[PDB]
Design a protein around this ligand. Structure first.
Ligand SMILES: NCCC[C@H](N)C(=O)O
Ligand SMILES: [K+]
Ligand SMILES: [K+]
Ligand SMILES: [K+]
Ligand SMILES: [K+]
Ligand SMILES: [K+]
Ligand SMILES: [K+]
Ligand SMILES: [K+]
Ligand SMILES: [K+]
Ligand SMILES: [K+]
Ligand SMILES: [K+]
Ligand SMILES: [K+]
Ligand SMILES: [K+]
Ligand SMILES: [K+]
Ligand SMILES: [K+]
Ligand SMILES: [K+]
Ligand SMILES: [K+]
Ligand SMILES: [K+]
Ligand SMILES: [K+]
Ligand SMILES: [K+]
Ligand SMILES: [K+]
Ligand SMILES: [K+]
Ligand SMILES: [K+]
Ligand SMILES: [K+]
Ligand SMILES: [K+]
Ligand SMILES: [K+]
Ligand SMILES: [K+]
Ligand SMILES: [K+]
Ligand SMILES: [K+]
Ligand SMILES: [K+]
Ligand SMILES: [K+]
Ligand SMILES: [K+]
Ligand SMILES: [K+]
Ligand SMILES: [Mg+2]
Ligand SMILES: [Mg+2]
Ligand SMILES: [Mg+2]
Ligand SMILES: [Mg+2]
Ligand SMILES: [Mg+2]
Ligand SMILES: [Mg+2]
Ligand SMILES: [Mg+2]
Ligand SMILES: [Mg+2]
Ligand SMILES: [Mg+2]
Ligand SMILES: [Mg+2]
Ligand SMILES: [Mg+2]
Ligand SMILES: [Mg+2]
Ligand SMILES: [Mg+2]
Ligand SMILES: [Mg+2]
Ligand SMILES: [Mg+2]
Ligand SMILES: [Mg+2]
Ligand SMILES: [Mg+2]
Ligand SMILES: [Mg+2]
Ligand SMILES: [Mg+2]
Ligand SMILES: [Mg+2]
Ligand SMILES: [Mg+2]
Ligand SMILES: [Mg+2]
Ligand SMILES: [Mg+2]
Ligand SMILES: [Mg+2]
Ligand SMILES: [Mg+2]
Ligand SMILES: [Mg+2]
Ligand SMILES: [Mg+2]
Ligand SMILES: [Mg+2]
Ligand SMILES: [Mg+2]
Ligand SMILES: [Mg+2]
Ligand SMILES: [Mg+2]
Ligand SMILES: [Mg+2]
Ligand SMILES: [Mg+2]
Ligand SMILES: [Mg+2]
Ligand SMILES: [Mg+2]
Ligand SMILES: [Mg+2]
Ligand SMILES: [Mg+2]
Ligand SMILES: [Mg+2]
Ligand SMILES: [Mg+2]
Ligand SMILES: [Mg+2]
Ligand SMILES: [Mg+2]
Ligand SMILES: [Mg+2]
Ligand SMILES: [Mg+2]
Ligand SMILES: [Mg+2]
Ligand SMILES: [Mg+2]
Ligand SMILES: [Mg+2]
Ligand SMILES: [Mg+2]
Ligand SMILES: [Mg+2]
Ligand SMILES: [Mg+2]
Ligand SMILES: [Mg+2]
Ligand SMILES: [Mg+2]
Ligand SMILES: [Mg+2]
Ligand SMILES: [Mg+2]
Ligand SMILES: [Mg+2]
Ligand SMILES: [Mg+2]
Ligand SMILES: [Mg+2]
Ligand SMILES: [Mg+2]
Ligand SMILES: [Mg+2]
Ligand SMILES: [Mg+2]
Ligand SMILES: [Mg+2]
Ligand SMILES: [Mg+2]
Ligand SMILES: [Mg+2]
Ligand SMILES: [Mg+2]
Ligand SMILES: [Mg+2]
Ligand SMILES: [Mg+2]
Ligand SMILES: [Mg+2]
Ligand SMILES: [Mg+2]
Ligand SMILES: [Mg+2]
Ligand SMILES: [Mg+2]
Ligand SMILES: [Mg+2]
Ligand SMILES: [Mg+2]
Ligand SMILES: [Mg+2]
Ligand SMILES: [Mg+2]
Ligand SMILES: [Mg+2]
Ligand SMILES: [Mg+2]
Ligand SMILES: [Mg+2]
Ligand SMILES: [Mg+2]
Ligand SMILES: [Mg+2]
Ligand SMILES: [Mg+2]
Ligand SMILES: [Mg+2]
Ligand SMILES: [Mg+2]
Ligand SMILES: [Mg+2]
Ligand SMILES: [Mg+2]
Ligand SMILES: [Mg+2]
Ligand SMILES: [Mg+2]
Ligand SMILES: [Mg+2]
Ligand SMILES: [Mg+2]
Lengths: 46, 34, 271
RNA sequence: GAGGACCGAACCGACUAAUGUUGAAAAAUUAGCGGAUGACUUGUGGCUGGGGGUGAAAGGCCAAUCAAACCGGGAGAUAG
RNA sequence: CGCCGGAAGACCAAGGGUUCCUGUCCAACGUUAAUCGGGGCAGGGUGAGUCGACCCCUAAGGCGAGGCCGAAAGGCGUAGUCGAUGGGAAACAGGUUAAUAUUCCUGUACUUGGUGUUACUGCGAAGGGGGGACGGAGAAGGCUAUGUUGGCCGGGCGACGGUUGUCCCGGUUUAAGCGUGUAGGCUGGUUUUCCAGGCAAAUCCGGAAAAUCAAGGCUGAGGCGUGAUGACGAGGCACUACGGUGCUGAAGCAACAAAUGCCCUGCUUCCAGGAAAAGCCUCUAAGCAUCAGGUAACAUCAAAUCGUACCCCAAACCGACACAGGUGGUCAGGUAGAGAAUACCAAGGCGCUUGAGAGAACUCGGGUGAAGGAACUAGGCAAAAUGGUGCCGUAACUUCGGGAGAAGGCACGCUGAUAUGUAGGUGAGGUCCCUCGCGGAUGGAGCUGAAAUCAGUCGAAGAUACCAGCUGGCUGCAACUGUUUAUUAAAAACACAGCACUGUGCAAACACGAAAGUGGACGUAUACGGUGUGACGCCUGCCCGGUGCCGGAAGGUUAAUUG
RNA sequence: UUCCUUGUCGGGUAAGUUCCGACCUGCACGAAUGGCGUAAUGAUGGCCAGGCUGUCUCCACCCGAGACUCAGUGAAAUUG
RNA sequence: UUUAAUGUUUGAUGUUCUAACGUUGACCCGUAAUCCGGGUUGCGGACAGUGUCUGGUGGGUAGUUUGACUGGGGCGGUCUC
RNA sequence: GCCCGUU
RNA sequence: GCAUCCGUAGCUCAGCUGGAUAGAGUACUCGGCUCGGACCGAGCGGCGGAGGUUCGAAUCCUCCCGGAUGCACCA
């Protein structure tokens, strides 16, 4: 049957992409936490 | 949720398997000690 | 003309429709139209702030002249049109200089009739003039409350306002609800009643007719759980409570007017 | 040539029975069944955020989780 | 040999990302073996002015200089600026690779800009106006895609009786563009004068007046001509690594039937009254005036960048799997049929990645059954049965619509005749007229073709398969169509049209918001909110002591404050 | 909605705790948290009849897919 | 106890006024702008509205409580002398 | 003001 | 089965004056008005049983009987 993950690249980048994270202060603290942990992928981008 | 299982990483909610009252074949007439 | 449908189906058995053949079968006047998109009852926070709103037919807004301040110039009535935005019908008028405007259509007004606003206009239905030059006892509609602001009272189909007294800089109006109210005498009004007075004689007949107007279904509070409404709960049909709103305020009797700056304009409240 | 009209495929749904129940499947299959121009159905995008939303109201649904989601923290809460 | 064929065929979007093609390998992966593979390794493969993105323009909505508001963080919003699922210039046919093609090649086209020359000329916007520009349902006419038959052309003379014919098989294809302007649709045309309107102006739009003409203009499928002395072409001939390659090539017409596609963003009708902005056309202001600019012809130049392989109802996407699940759009052949149902087929694609035997109980999915026919069981659960078209016929009750397909019954194949194929549909030639052409009248060849009657005939059975209502009687509840516990409950529950009470005079009540503000509503008491009841018919009685709400103000009691 | 209760009487059956009609002794109906009716409608609750049948008396045989044997691959719950 | 007179002075109610304050009335400008601000004017007007303090109401929302004994709990009874 | 009945 | 409240004149109901004294309406009886009602005037008529406290009980105890009300739940 129909499952929960239905992929769409435009809706992916608009919801959790890099400019979406940089637009609010709470999204910028997500990127600071992921840089502090040292992650190889910061956002869900291309 | 069971979020770090190494034996079964594909599944997080598993009590539909072994808990008898959560299986799809559970009937409430099994609970007749009432 | 009030038409009863024949019961060829259970959704048609009770339908009563109002049919006016004098309306304009055709497209509306395009330079007086504007886009009017729907809300769903939601404000700029995105929350529902008025319930039971949603869906319905797409509608274009018609710019209706509520001010009637193009004075001294006469206007002929071209045709009567349908307006989906109000219960009243509207009329397209043509002024002598070539200007076209929508006005509210008053009772007994046909195509070819001659209207004129202004302080020197005549006392006949359709004309707009300040209430200091309307005789006491006349039947008016589209009444201003502030001078120059535009008509705000008695706009709905079949409604009117009686001028009961003029003493001073004020006139006393008998409103449609039965309220006596003081409005100042330099405010404008239009002579006559509003047309389409059998608008209240129609019967929708079925549930889908109310959904065509953008009215969503009402759930009774006594049909809910106590977490949802004060009336909720019960093992069977139980009420036991004093009737309240979804936010706990007593309905069925309790007055909610709280406005201390307009109380000096209200002579008598409705009863 | 009207209709929340009629019969009936696509399409939407889920009333009955059998199978399956370490399944082919964490809810299906087979045979029948209901709606099928409408209060219908569907694609793409958008809005509403947790004592909050949304609800033709079943405590239903809010990412296989809901009489208060999930993640991190107070936190080694407390446990006659 | 079997299966699908409104897909299990073909082409895409979304999503995936090399799974595509060629060579090579078989450890692991593949529910078995594997020489094979969507597996390992290596190499190759995606070619655009016209397709799409980007781009210009906006919807919902987002962000938002100043601004308004908020302990801080921030919230809302103006001017703006983003945002497609919508609007906006232009290409077709044929050929070719192992793998790309409307992109390469061949043939024939089209669009928008820049620059230059010549000829002529009031050009100019952040402004005005037009246009773009829009619903549901229904009906009819004209067409095409496509199909069938005939004619034509090429081939055949049959493994077993017959088959030189009223015989059999195959082919009979051709685009954009350019030219013509038809079926159909809409609308009167032209000139002059004037004006409280279109934020100023206007020769444009709107309004008024007068004269004159009986016609004009706009839109538009298809057809026809050209494109095309070409291309393609059944086959034949010549080589070959037997995969394929090279050359030549006949006919290439007519009739009938016919769409859910086109004319049609039309027409008719209804109420629930049906986006926006730019490109486009036009008007003028500031302004410039032998300038600049505008219009036409000709020449020349430019049209960048990114995507393009492959899968896409699936073994490549979402489901942990090569998982009986889920997934939007486009194309729509034949015979029978009302049909996109169903049965059998075409083009095309497949036999679902363990097999071989045996023929016990029992389980699953089916077939048939003596006599009886619900005796079974909580309960006719499940099965069995009914089933089509035409005609005859049809009760109580009723809100006069219904009930009703009530119930029940009769006919049904094939052959011949009526009639060498009828009624109807289509309509060539010939003739006549003019408006001389895509015209009208007459005319009927040819093609297509029901339904009925009479007579005969075969079978147990003619709606023969697939497909395809069981019917009737009494009663509870809910008026009805709808909605709901995704995964044990579809209902008598919820909703509903209708009814009533109550609040609400507009800066409305009320709701979301420390606020600003927003919804209610660009609505105004025939309106909006809340509550209860629930179509319709007949009705809805008595009680205000209690609790609540509304009204009252005399008296009693009574806060901060004052002292 | 009625505990006593399978109340009593009538109908239907050879036989009816259910059904239909009536009576009133309403444990404990009742008028818009509506009363009583009601044509049409319902995958709604109850009851009866005709047709039909492996539902049953009471099972028998047959066609396929497993079960069984051979070859290859090769699990699970549980367990002092 | 009871009143009037002169001199001096608050509270109440009422009536006008405008100048604080309101304006989701009109017009002009910033300005290519239904925001906002400034200006002119009209209507309200010391009212309304807001801050501090204060009485009432307040399951709208929150934090909690709701005993033990007991031939099982509940119900009943009991709890000290 | 009220003032029933009579096998 | 448990709990709570009631038994008073022929009938329906007061009286707990905290223990020292029983009443009302209606019925019935007698007399009058007119034949009978209605009406008027007078009268008559007794603490559910059985023990106990008490100087003394309808009243307070204990048991019994009768009549009502509520409860008898989770399995
Ligand atoms: N939202 C879906 C997450 C699926 C995950 N593997 C699970 O078993 O929950
Ligand atoms: K409702
Ligand atoms: K309930
Ligand atoms: K129809
Ligand atoms: K939609
Ligand atoms: K929460
Ligand atoms: K989740
Ligand atoms: K191998
Ligand atoms: K496998
Ligand atoms: K698009
Ligand atoms: K322009
Ligand atoms: K326009
Ligand atoms: K004009
Ligand atoms: K390609
Ligand atoms: K065997
Ligand atoms: K049928
Ligand atoms: K009813
Ligand atoms: K249902
Ligand atoms: K429900
Ligand atoms: K109302
Ligand atoms: K609005
Ligand atoms: K009362
Ligand atoms: K009261
Ligand atoms: K009262
Ligand atoms: K009852
Ligand atoms: K009998
Ligand atoms: K009987
Ligand atoms: K049903
Ligand atoms: K029924
Ligand atoms: K002012
Ligand atoms: K105040
Ligand atoms: K004990
Ligand atoms: K015990
Ligand atoms: Mg509402
Ligand atoms: Mg309602
Ligand atoms: Mg409920
Ligand atoms: Mg509550
Ligand atoms: Mg109840
Ligand atoms: Mg229908
Ligand atoms: Mg559903
Ligand atoms: Mg089902
Ligand atoms: Mg099915
Ligand atoms: Mg049906
Ligand atoms: Mg149907
Ligand atoms: Mg169906
Ligand atoms: Mg609809
Ligand atoms: Mg979507
Ligand atoms: Mg519940
Ligand atoms: Mg999850
Ligand atoms: Mg869930
Ligand atoms: Mg909680
Ligand atoms: Mg701590
Ligand atoms: Mg711990
Ligand atoms: Mg087949
Ligand atoms: Mg690879
Ligand atoms: Mg390959
Ligand atoms: Mg292997
Ligand atoms: Mg392959
Ligand atoms: Mg490979
Ligand atoms: Mg590889
Ligand atoms: Mg483009
Ligand atoms: Mg903003
Ligand atoms: Mg701070
Ligand atoms: Mg833009
Ligand atoms: Mg390819
Ligand atoms: Mg324009
Ligand atoms: Mg064509
Ligand atoms: Mg030849
Ligand atoms: Mg020949
Ligand atoms: Mg032979
Ligand atoms: Mg614009
Ligand atoms: Mg996949
Ligand atoms: Mg998968
Ligand atoms: Mg996974
Ligand atoms: Mg997953
Ligand atoms: Mg497989
Ligand atoms: Mg699959
Ligand atoms: Mg689908
Ligand atoms: Mg089919
Ligand atoms: Mg084939
Ligand atoms: Mg067998
Ligand atoms: Mg038999
Ligand atoms: Mg036989
Ligand atoms: Mg037999
Ligand atoms: Mg039986
Ligand atoms: Mg039996
Ligand atoms: Mg059945
Ligand atoms: Mg009958
Ligand atoms: Mg009839
Ligand atoms: Mg009839
Ligand atoms: Mg019939
Ligand atoms: Mg015959
Ligand atoms: Mg019953
Ligand atoms: Mg219903
Ligand atoms: Mg239904
Ligand atoms: Mg459930
Ligand atoms: Mg369920
Ligand atoms: Mg569930
Ligand atoms: Mg079920
Ligand atoms: Mg169900
Ligand atoms: Mg309301
Ligand atoms: Mg109800
Ligand atoms: Mg009061
Ligand atoms: Mg009986
Ligand atoms: Mg009965
Ligand atoms: Mg009731
Ligand atoms: Mg009741
Ligand atoms: Mg009542
Ligand atoms: Mg009531
Ligand atoms: Mg009834
Ligand atoms: Mg075996
Ligand atoms: Mg083996
Ligand atoms: Mg004042
Ligand atoms: Mg609480
Ligand atoms: Mg605590
Ligand atoms: Mg205890
Ligand atoms: Mg006990
Ligand atoms: Mg008598
Ligand atoms: Mg006598
Ligand atoms: Mg005694």
């Amino acid at each position: 049957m129909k499952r929960t993950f239905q992929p769409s690249v435009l809706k992916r980048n608009r919801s959790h992409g890099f400019r979406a994270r940089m637009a609010t202060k709470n999204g910028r603290q997500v990127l600071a936490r992921r840089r502090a942990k040292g992650r190889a992928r910061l956002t869900v981008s291309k | 949720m069971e979020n770090n299982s190494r034996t079964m990483p594909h599944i997080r909610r598993t009590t539909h398997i072994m808990k008898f009252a959560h299986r799809n074949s559970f009937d409430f007439h099994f609970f007749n000690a009432r | 003309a009030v038409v009863k449908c024949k019961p060829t189906s259970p959704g048609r058995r009770h339908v009563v429709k109002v049919v006016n053949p004098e309306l304009h079968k055709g497209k509306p006047f395009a330079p007086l139209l504007e886009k009017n998109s729907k809300s769903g009852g939601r404000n700029n926070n995105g929350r529902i702030t008025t319930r039971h709103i949603g869906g319905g037919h797409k509608q274009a807004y018609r710019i209706v002249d509520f001010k009637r301040n193009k004075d001294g110039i006469p206007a002929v009535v071209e045709r009567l049109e349908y307006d989906p935005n109000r219960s009243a019908n509207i009329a397209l008028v043509l002024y002598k200089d070539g200007e076209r405007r929508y006005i509210l259509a008053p009772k007994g007004l046909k195509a070819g009739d001659q209207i004129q606003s202004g302080v020197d206009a005549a006392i006949k239905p359709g004309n707009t003039l300040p209430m200091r030059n309307i005789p006491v006892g006349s039947t008016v509609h589209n009444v201003e409350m502030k001078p120059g602001k535009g008509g705000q009272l008695a706009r709905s189909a079949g409604t009117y306002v009686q001028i009961v007294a003029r003493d001073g800089a004020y006139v006393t109006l008998r409103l449609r609800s039965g309220e006596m109210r003081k409005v100042e005498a330099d405010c404008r009004a239009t002579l006559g009643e509003v047309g389409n007075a059998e608008h209240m004689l129609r019967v929708l007949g079925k549930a889908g007719a109310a959904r065509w107007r953008g009215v969503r279904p009402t759930v009774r509070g006594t049909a809910m759980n106590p977490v949802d409404h004060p009336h909720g709960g019960g093992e069977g049909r139980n009420f036991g409570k004093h009737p309240v709103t979804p936010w706990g305020v007593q309905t069925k009797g309790k007055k909610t007017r709280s406005n201390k700056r307009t109380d000096k304009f209200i002579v008598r409240r409705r009863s």
